[PDB]
Amino acid sequence: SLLEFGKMILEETGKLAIPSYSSYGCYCGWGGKGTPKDATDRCCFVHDCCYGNLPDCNPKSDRYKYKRVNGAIVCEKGTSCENRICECDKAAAICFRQNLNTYSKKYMLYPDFLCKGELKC
Numbered sequence: 129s130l131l132e133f134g135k136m137i138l139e140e141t142g143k144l145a146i147p148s149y150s151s152y153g154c155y156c157g158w159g160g161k162g163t164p165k166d167a168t169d170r171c172c173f174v175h176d177c178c179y180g181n182l183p184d185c186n187p188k189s190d191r192y193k194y195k196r197v198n199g200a201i202v203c204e205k206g207t208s209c210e211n212r213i214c215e216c217d218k219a220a221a222i223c224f225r226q227n228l229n230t231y232s233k234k235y236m237l238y239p240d241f242l243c244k245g246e247l248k249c
């Protein structure tokens with residue numbers, strides 16, 4: 129679920145999901161179109177695509193379970209949707225962590241009109 133994903137992001141990066149990753153670039157918090165602005169935004173594009181692989185799951189509300197194994201995120205067995213949603217969120221959180229070195233506050237609250245065209249998953 130959104131809140132869990134937010135906590136996972138905080139644990140991983142030390143940044144609050146909202147507002148650090150809720151309105152970032154073209155795809156974080158509201159993706160849809162355009163070329164991702166940077167690596168972090170690309171994390172969101174892929175996460176969007178990942179959720180898109182699950183048209184009959186409900187990532188915003190469905191809660192999954194995960195544990196920490198010496199820092200590593202391990203998605204624990206739930207329903208198929210929960211397992212897949214967890215792996216999507218896990219990837220995004222790790223991707224955010226791996227790209228903190230280029231994260232730019234200038235992309236927070238990025239305007240929609242600067243995101244043009246469709247980029248295929």
Ligand SMILES: COc1ccc2c(c1)c(CC(=O)O)c(C)n2C(=O)c1ccc(Cl)cc1
Nearest residue numbers: 157158176177179180183184185186187188
């Ligand atoms: C390819 O791009 C997508 C597609 C679907 C998406 C998202 C991004 C995000 C992105 C986000 O909030 O990070 C959410 C939440 N989507 C959904 O969950 C969703 C769930 C159920 C149905 Cl039936 C349809 C869509």
